[PDB]
């Protein structure tokens, strides 16, 4: 087999992904091994589609290759070192040390030049939060384009519900690149220390008005009103990610 051979299994680091050298060129890669599957099919080469476009930019993970072997498929990716922001974040929830404003608003700005860059390729992440944030200057990179579609598809596999704008779970597909933005205020806010997301219910409900969750520690006016129009009701009093990029608080 083509991965047992081109190289040496280091660790699993995802339930499969696992941390791999690559025997001729020495270098450490991330590979996700899953069950080969239509419409399922369709679904998991959109993922290497998307990848094989999105390979230009610094805070996107890097796609190296991909292949099919047994019933698996298989995608080797950049590796990045530093885990999930996801990890991250619940190490700061366990020491009550969070990102910081200055760490926030870098934070923001790498994923939002992803995101930039993403939505300039008239594609659309739709699983924006920061289990696929990964880190590497710490080096925010977007992973998992397991939901990216292109922008005016008339269907749409919905991400995370903790994550996911109303609008997306209405249907409503008018303005899909507005929904990774309300999900990337979303993963700010959790970087920021705040509790665990709801997945329903009436907290839940109360994001999609507006409201940001409560955040254990003082941040500027101008950042928290920033975050706030970001989770906007009306995608469209929501920033692009080029007006996000380019934001004075930023
Ligand atoms: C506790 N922590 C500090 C480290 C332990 C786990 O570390 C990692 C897990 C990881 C990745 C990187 C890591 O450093 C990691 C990467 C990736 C993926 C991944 C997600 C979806 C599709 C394909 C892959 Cl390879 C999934 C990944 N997982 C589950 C990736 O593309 N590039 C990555 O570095
Ligand atoms: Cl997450």
Wanted: proline share 4%; charged share 25%.
């Amino acid at each position: 087999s083509r991965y047992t051979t081109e190289f040496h299994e280091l660790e699993k680091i995802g339930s499969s992904v696992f941390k791999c050298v690559k025997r001729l060129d020495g270098c450490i890669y991330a590979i996700k091994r899953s069950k080969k599957p239509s419409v399922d099919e369709q679904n998991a080469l959109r993922e290497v589609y998307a990848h094989a476009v999105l390979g230009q930019h610094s805070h996107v993970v890097r796609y190296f290759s991909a292949w099919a072997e047994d019933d698996h498929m298989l995608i080797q990716n950049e590796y990045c070192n530093g885990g999930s922001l996801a990890d991250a974040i619940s190490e700061n929830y366990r020491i009550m040390s969070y990102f910081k404003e200055a760490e926030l608003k870098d934070l923001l700005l790498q994923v939002g030049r992803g995101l930039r860059y993403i939505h300039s390729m008239s594609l659309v992440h739709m699983d924006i939060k920061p289990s696929n944030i990964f880190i590497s200057k710490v080096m925010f990179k977007i992973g998992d384009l397991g939901h990216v579609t292109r922008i005016s598809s008339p269907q749409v596999e919905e991400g995370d519900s903790r994550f996911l704008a109303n609008e997306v779970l209405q249907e409503n597909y008018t303005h899909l690149p507005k929904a990774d933005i309300f999900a990337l205020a979303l993963t700010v806010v959790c970087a920021a220390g705040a509790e665990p997301l709801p997945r329903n219910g009436d907290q839940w409900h109360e994001i999609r008005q507006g409201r940001l969750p409560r955040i254990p520690q003082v941040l500027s006016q101008e950042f928290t009103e920033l975050l706030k129009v970001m989770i906007h009701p009306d995608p469209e009093r929501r920033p692009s990610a080029m007006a996000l990029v380019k934001h004075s608080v930023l």
